[PDB]
Design a binder for this molecule. Structure first.
Ligand SMILES: [Zn+2]
Ligand SMILES: [Zn+2]
Ligand SMILES: [Zn+2]
Ligand SMILES: [Zn+2]
Ligand SMILES: [Zn+2]
Ligand SMILES: [Zn+2]
Ligand SMILES: [Zn+2]
Ligand SMILES: [Zn+2]
Ligand SMILES: [Zn+2]
Ligand SMILES: [Zn+2]
Lengths: 58, 58, 58, 58
């Protein structure tokens, strides 16, 4: 599975979305061609807009 | 928007799924990395598993 | 199935939501305890917040 | 939040579904008029069909 870093804060707006905390690491489980990604953070799973994060370049 | 052709029949199992008629042409609007695609057929819009279809860009 | 009248305009904000036009009639197919309802209007199906509509009293 | 007890085992068939262990207690957070309920069990959150469970308010 694929890690990404939160560049911008995101407050979940629907119950199946994941709130993103600026500076944290999320695990991306799934990508959609429309730019919504599904991932996990701190025991929570859900959808977020991909342009709030940047995939880790290791 | 992209055409795909139905190889195997698929009965919608959830309310947001599209039933696929064998041999028919569907318009794929969206693709997700877990193999679910979203498309339309004869007025209807829904998700379906991509291993039941075959993409065209021929 | 159960008709309702749109009291307030709603512009769909996710792809599985239904835009509501002020004054139109929607068919409600499903209600959720959190207040999201699923219905159809003019060949479109999707979710909307129930407090934008009023169930028809006939 | 409301307890329900699992009568029949259920294997999650979609990524947003909850697997139900027979005999276990789940917390139902939400109910939809088509018979899908959303609940939690041992850290996990997901949808499941309500005819596999039995509500308590005893
Ligand atoms: Zn927004
Ligand atoms: Zn999408
Ligand atoms: Zn790194
Ligand atoms: Zn199936
Ligand atoms: Zn998926
Ligand atoms: Zn809103
Ligand atoms: Zn809900
Ligand atoms: Zn009337
Ligand atoms: Zn099933
Ligand atoms: Zn439903």
């Amino acid at each position: 599975x694929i890690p990404a870093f939160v560049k911008f804060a995101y407050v979940a707006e629907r119950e199946d979305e994941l709130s993103l905390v600026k500076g944290s690491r999320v695990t991306v489980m799934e990508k959609c061609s429309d730019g919504w990604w599904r991932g996990s953070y701190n025991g929570q799973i859900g959808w977020f807009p991909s342009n709030y994060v940047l995939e880790e370049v290791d």
